[PDB]
Design a protein around this ligand. Structure first.
Ligand SMILES: Nc1ncnc2c1ncn2[C@@H]1O[C@H](COP(=O)(O)OP(=O)(O)O)[C@@H](O)[C@H]1O
Ligand SMILES: Nc1ncnc2c1ncn2[C@@H]1O[C@H](COP(=O)(O)OP(=O)(O)O)[C@@H](O)[C@H]1O
Length: 214
């Protein structure tokens, strides 16, 4: 099974991707997580990406496409994968289509801007692993600590309020057109398309996605 999750930054995609990976046994392919890992490792890609992500801008399509191409060639993706934050632009979607990669489900998260801004304020990450929490809506079991390692949680540099505003503007300009892109693919019979109300509690969105995916 192959899935794309579509939605604004902060819509809840990475949170729900964890549950899908656990139940359906397919890896989460998050280009944000992979780019942050490149920074953490000090790879050449990481050297290029850090300043761009910190500014709330998109990394070049050609670099991200190559990153995803290599990732999905790895053994753990042989039987499917979940794309989370990719494709992010029409050229990224066209590259995957040109490559001959169809997906089985495209799942769109419907969340208004007003809620995203307010919501991202509380996002906390365990920076080494990428595990994601919210101080209120999905808190760690011990305040400020990762559930697995007990290490202190951090705030992402690009989650600062002014950067979030910029990121959202760019989402609507560059990324929201993928809604029509994959709606059209579904009309052609190339994928199934569904939209979930991502303003509901985490558990309710999870149940809605479980009903769609079986
Ligand atoms: N597919 C992509 N194309 C270009 N840049 C990307 C892509 N995925 C992630 N990024 C970069 O990583 C940043 C953070 O993205 P992401 O981790 O998906 O955060 P969020 O879930 O808040 O949108 C983006 O603002 C961009 O700089
Ligand atoms: N349904 C929800 N209601 C409230 N908060 C949520 C929900 N889903 C996720 N969150 C929290 O809001 C923030 C953004 O969720 P995240 O999964 O990181 O979104 P994305 O991957 O789309 O950027 C995180 O801090 C997360 O814990």
């Amino acid at each position: 099974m192959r899935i794309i999750l579509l939605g604004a930054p902060g819509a809840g995609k990475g949170t729900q991707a964890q549950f899908i990976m656990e139940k359906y046994g397919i890896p989460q392919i998050s280009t944000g997580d992979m780019l942050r890992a490149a920074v953490k490792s000090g790879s050449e890609l990481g050297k290029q990406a850090k300043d761009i992500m910190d500014a709330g801008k998109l990394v070049t399509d050609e670099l991200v496409i190559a990153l995803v191409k290599e990732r999905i060639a790895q053994e753990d993706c042989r039987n499917g994968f979940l794309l989370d934050g990719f494709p992010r632009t029409i050229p990224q979607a066209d590259a995957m289509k040109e490559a001959g990669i169809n997906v089985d489900y495209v799942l769109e998260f419907d969340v208004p801007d007003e809620l995203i801004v307010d919501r991202i304020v509380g996002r906390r990450v365990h920076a080494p692993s990428g595990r994601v929490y919210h101080v209120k809506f999905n808190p760690p079991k011990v305040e400020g600590k990762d559930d697995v390692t007990g290490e202190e949680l951090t705030t992402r540099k690009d989650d600062q309020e002014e950067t979030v505003r910029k990121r959202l503007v760019e989402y609507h300009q560059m990324t929201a057109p993928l809604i029509g892109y994959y709606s059209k693919e579904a009309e052609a019979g190339n994928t199934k398309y569904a939209k979930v109300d991502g303003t509901k509690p985490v558990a309710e969105v999870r149940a809605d996605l479980e009903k769609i995916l079986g």
